[PDB]
From Swiss-Prot:
<feature type="binding site">
    <location>
        <position position="99"/>
    </location>
    <ligand>
        <name>Ca(2+) 2</name>
    </ligand>
</feature>
<feature type="binding site">
    <location>
        <position position="107"/>
    </location>
    <ligand>
        <name>Ca(2+) 3</name>
    </ligand>
</feature>
<comment type="subunit">
    <text>Homotetramer. Heterodimer; heterodimerizes with SYT2 in presence of calcium. Interacts with SCAMP5. Interacts with STON2. Forms a complex with SV2B, syntaxin 1 and SNAP25. Interacts with SV2A, SV2B and SV2C. Interacts with RIMS1. Interacts with PRRT2. Interacts with DNAJC5 in a phosphorylation-dependent manner. Interacts (via N-terminus) with RAB3A. Interacts with SYT12. Interacts with calmodulin. Interacts with DNM1 (via C-terminal proline-rich domain (PRD)); this interaction facilitates vesicle fission during clathrin-mediated endocytosis (CME).</text>
</comment>
<comment type="function">
    <text>Calcium sensor that participates in triggering neurotransmitter release at the synapse. May have a regulatory role in the membrane interactions during trafficking of synaptic vesicles at the active zone of the synapse. It binds acidic phospholipids with a specificity that requires the presence of both an acidic head group and a diacyl backbone. A Ca(2+)-dependent interaction between synaptotagmin and putative receptors for activated protein kinase C has also been reported. It can bind to at least three additional proteins in a Ca(2+)-independent manner; these are neurexins, syntaxin and AP2.</text>
</comment>
<comment type="similarity">
    <text>Belongs to the synaptotagmin family.</text>
</comment>
<feature type="binding site">
    <location>
        <position position="101"/>
    </location>
    <ligand>
        <name>Ca(2+) 3</name>
    </ligand>
</feature>
<feature type="binding site">
    <location>
        <position position="42"/>
    </location>
    <ligand>
        <name>Ca(2+) 2</name>
    </ligand>
</feature>
<feature type="binding site">
    <location>
        <position position="100"/>
    </location>
    <ligand>
        <name>Ca(2+) 1</name>
    </ligand>
</feature>
<feature type="modified residue" description="Phosphoserine">
    <location>
        <position position="133"/>
    </location>
</feature>
<feature type="binding site">
    <location>
        <position position="101"/>
    </location>
    <ligand>
        <name>Ca(2+) 2</name>
    </ligand>
</feature>
<feature type="binding site">
    <location>
        <position position="43"/>
    </location>
    <ligand>
        <name>Ca(2+) 2</name>
    </ligand>
</feature>
<feature type="binding site">
    <location>
        <position position="107"/>
    </location>
    <ligand>
        <name>Ca(2+) 2</name>
    </ligand>
</feature>
<feature type="binding site">
    <location>
        <position position="101"/>
    </location>
    <ligand>
        <name>Ca(2+) 1</name>
    </ligand>
</feature>
<protein>
    <recommendedName>
        <fullName>Synaptotagmin-1</fullName>
    </recommendedName>
</protein>
<feature type="binding site">
    <location>
        <position position="104"/>
    </location>
    <ligand>
        <name>Ca(2+) 3</name>
    </ligand>
</feature>
<feature type="binding site">
    <location>
        <position position="105"/>
    </location>
    <ligand>
        <name>Ca(2+) 3</name>
    </ligand>
</feature>
<feature type="modified residue" description="Phosphotyrosine">
    <location>
        <position position="98"/>
    </location>
</feature>
Amino acid sequence: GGGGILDSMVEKLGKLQYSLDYDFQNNQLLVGIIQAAELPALDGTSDPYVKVFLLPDKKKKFETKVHRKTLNPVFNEQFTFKVPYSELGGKTLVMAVYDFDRFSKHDIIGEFKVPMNTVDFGHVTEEWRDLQSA
Ligand SMILES: [Mn+2]
């Protein structure tokens, strides 16, 4: 009654652990794409990879390596965004997990966003985030 409330709940599409730190010495944002867990199987298991990028920036998106046939990949990758601190406040970091497929569109598994204006810089941020439907 009931069903409508269940439909509003966050779907079980897995989670991604990432870390974030602004390097004030070099003036760049550092992002760690650590691992994902409990991904749904779209293939069976999926072939997950993560796209990492800033909005509204129109720059080419960074991507992790593809991890074949796993619902619990460990990426252990780091990415760097050369952006002065004063300009970072208006941007939003996006992390999106996709299922690599060689013969068809890569299905999105889920994504989430981290507005830079609500992040506590000066201390390394690390958290698990539930992937949201795209
Ligand atoms: Mn696949």
